[PDB]
Design an enzyme around this catalytic site. Structure first.
Site, PDB file in Angstrom:
ATOM      1  N   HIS A  74       4.806 -16.150  -3.631  1.00  0.00           N
ATOM      2  CA  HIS A  74       4.548 -15.519  -4.825  1.00  0.00           C
ATOM      3  C   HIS A  74       5.153 -13.908  -5.038  1.00  0.00           C
ATOM      4  CE1 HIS A  74       0.720 -13.742  -3.070  1.00  0.00           C
ATOM      5  NE2 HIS A  74       1.336 -12.754  -4.027  1.00  0.00           N
ATOM      6  N   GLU A  81       7.971   2.285   8.027  1.00  0.00           N
ATOM      7  CA  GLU A  81       7.176   3.216   6.735  1.00  0.00           C
ATOM      8  C   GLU A  81       5.522   3.644   7.341  1.00  0.00           C
ATOM      9  OE1 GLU A  81       8.097   4.804   4.324  1.00  0.00           O
ATOM     10  OE2 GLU A  81       9.511   3.841   3.136  1.00  0.00           O
ATOM     11  N   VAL A 136       7.294   9.168   0.450  1.00  0.00           N
ATOM     12  CA  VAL A 136       7.842  10.230   0.965  1.00  0.00           C
ATOM     13  C   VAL A 136       8.831   9.892   2.146  1.00  0.00           C
ATOM     14  CG1 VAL A 136       7.909  12.345   2.239  1.00  0.00           C
ATOM     15  CG2 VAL A 136       6.417  12.178   0.482  1.00  0.00           C
ATOM     16  N   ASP A 181       2.298 -20.658   0.454  1.00  0.00           N
ATOM     17  CA  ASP A 181       2.586 -19.331  -0.104  1.00  0.00           C
ATOM     18  C   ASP A 181       3.142 -18.475   1.128  1.00  0.00           C
ATOM     19  OD1 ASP A 181       2.715 -17.412  -1.745  1.00  0.00           O
ATOM     20  OD2 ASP A 181       0.718 -16.787  -1.804  1.00  0.00           O
ATOM     21  N   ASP A 231     -11.872  -5.804   1.951  1.00  0.00           N
ATOM     22  CA  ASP A 231     -10.904  -7.118   1.447  1.00  0.00           C
ATOM     23  C   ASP A 231      -9.379  -6.376   1.236  1.00  0.00           C
ATOM     24  OD1 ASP A 231     -10.021  -9.440   0.686  1.00  0.00           O
ATOM     25  OD2 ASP A 231     -11.341  -9.410  -1.113  1.00  0.00           O
ATOM     26  N   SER A 232      -8.217  -7.278   1.206  1.00  0.00           N
ATOM     27  CA  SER A 232      -7.229  -6.992   1.077  1.00  0.00           C
ATOM     28  C   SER A 232      -7.229  -6.885  -0.767  1.00  0.00           C
ATOM     29  CB  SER A 232      -6.090  -8.008   1.396  1.00  0.00           C
ATOM     30  OG  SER A 232      -6.217  -9.217   1.158  1.00  0.00           O
ATOM     31  N   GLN A 253      -4.235  -5.875  -4.496  1.00  0.00           N
ATOM     32  CA  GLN A 253      -3.366  -5.913  -5.134  1.00  0.00           C
ATOM     33  C   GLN A 253      -2.484  -4.889  -4.707  1.00  0.00           C
ATOM     34  OE1 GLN A 253      -6.084  -6.524  -7.485  1.00  0.00           O
ATOM     35  NE2 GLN A 253      -5.216  -8.898  -7.282  1.00  0.00           N
ATOM     36  N   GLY A 254      -1.163  -5.355  -4.133  1.00  0.00           N
ATOM     37  CA  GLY A 254      -0.090  -4.586  -3.397  1.00  0.00           C
ATOM     38  C   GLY A 254      -0.146  -4.989  -2.088  1.00  0.00           C
ATOM     39  N   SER A 293      -0.276  -8.216  -0.755  1.00  0.00           N
ATOM     40  CA  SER A 293       0.251  -9.535  -0.839  1.00  0.00           C
ATOM     41  C   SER A 293       1.364  -9.611   0.094  1.00  0.00           C
ATOM     42  CB  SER A 293       0.658  -9.952  -2.254  1.00  0.00           C
ATOM     43  OG  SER A 293      -0.286 -10.807  -2.801  1.00  0.00           O
ATOM     44  N   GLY A 294       1.361 -10.810   0.837  1.00  0.00           N
ATOM     45  CA  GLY A 294       2.992 -10.927   1.778  1.00  0.00           C
ATOM     46  C   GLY A 294       2.502 -10.207   3.064  1.00  0.00           C
TER      47      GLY A 294
END
Ligand SMILES: [Ca+2]
Lengths: 223, 14
Positions: free
Chosen positions: A40, A52, A57, A84, A171-172, A174-175, A177-178
């Site tokens: 997704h 990273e 920055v 997914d 929890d995990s 939004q952002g 994902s993956g």
């Protein structure tokens, strides 16, 4: 990540950020040329950011490499979210070192109660938006498929598992994902979906990586 | 009630 902790710079050296003029998903480096993410998160023109910590920055250890191919599972289902999983091949091989390193694929599926590390640059607030500069981490247990299907009736397939805390707060989000779910040094899951984030009786849902090792190996061989 | 964890998210009425 909601209810997590600052990981520390480059302490999760397989974590990558997928960037399209902003960070939009995570991923995991599995060899010098390939990253595992969620289907997704597919889009054309992905830039992969390795090494990273502060995503806002440039600090010096980053490697930016464009995706040459972004390969969703051929049976990914955009409604049920079954399968997914996506493979991203890099235009050039990453330089592997201490801060940019691959994570092993599993040799067996993990069992419920096993403790894993989930990481990402996603939202840190369960109702609202606050996006961190630096990478965040969460330790969380795999839940039983029984509890998973009780939380998400009719919605959990054989290629999904739940991890987290049924009391909420961790929890995990939004952002994330993956990105990775790592248990005993093996990549067992991919951040996928949930009913909101960190809500009571609504744990995170994750793609079951152990079911795809053959497909991953064949895809690397055929690209 | 199912929502992916991408930016932006896809979240369904279920
Ligand atoms: Ca940076």
């Amino acid at each position: 990540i909601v209810g997590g902790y600052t990981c520390g710079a480059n302490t999760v050296p397989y974590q990558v950020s997928l960037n399209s003029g902003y960070h939009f998903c995570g991923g995991s480096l599995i060899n010098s040329q390939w990253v595992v993410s969620a289907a997704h998160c597919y889009k054309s023109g992905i830039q992969v950011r390795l090494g990273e910590d502060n995503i806002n920055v440039v600090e010096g250890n980053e490697q930016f490499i464009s995706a040459s191919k972004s390969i969703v599972h051929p049976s990914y289902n955009s409604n049920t979210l079954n399968n997914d999983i996506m493979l991203i091949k890099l235009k050039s091989a990453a330089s592997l070192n201490s801060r940019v390193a691959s994570i092993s694929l599993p040799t067996s599926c993990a069992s419920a109660g096993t403790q894993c590390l989930i990481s990402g640059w996603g939202n840190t607030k369960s109702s609202g938006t606050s996006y961190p500069d630096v990478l965040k981490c969460l330790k969380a247990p795999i839940l039983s498929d029984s509890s998973c299907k009780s939380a998400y009736p009719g919605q959990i397939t054989s290629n999904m598992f739940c991890a987290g805390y049924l009391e909420g707060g961790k929890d995990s989000c939004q952002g994330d994902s993956g990105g990775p779910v790592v248990c005993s040094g093996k990549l067992q899951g991919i951040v996928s979906w949930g009913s909101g984030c960190a809500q009571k009786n609504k744990p995170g849902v994750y793609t079951k990586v152990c079911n795809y090792v053959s497909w991953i190996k064949q895809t690397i061989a055929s690209n | 009630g199912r929502g992916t964890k991408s930016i932006p998210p896809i979240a369904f009425p279920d």
